[PDB]
Amino acid sequence: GSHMKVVYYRALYPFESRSHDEITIQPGDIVMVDESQTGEPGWLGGELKGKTGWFPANYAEKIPE
Ligand SMILES: [Cl-]
Ligand SMILES: [Zn+2]
Numbered sequence: 001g002s003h004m005k006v007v008y009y010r011a012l013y014p015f016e017s018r019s020h021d022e023i024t025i026q027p028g029d030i031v032m033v034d035e036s037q038t039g040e041p042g043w044l045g046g047e048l049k050g051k052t053g054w055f056p057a058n059y060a061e062k063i064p065e
């Protein structure tokens with residue numbers, strides 16, 4: 001994917017990671033996001049609890065700065 005200026009997303013729906021490059025999120029988790037892979041809806045990539053990876057972009061919401 002592509003790097004972007006670091007931003008924070010709050011998870012809205014649960015997602016369970018399966019591959020190395022995915023992360024698990026639960027509603028309310030805050031992810032520090034620095035990557036995207038464009039798609040419909042595509043993927044966002046970032047760090048949560050010491051792990052890094054993709055999660056589906058429509059499963060979280062951008063937190064205003
Ligand atoms: Cl797609
Ligand atoms: Zn493995």
Ligand SMILES: [Zn+2]
Pocket residue numbers: 019021
């Ligand atoms: Zn992959």
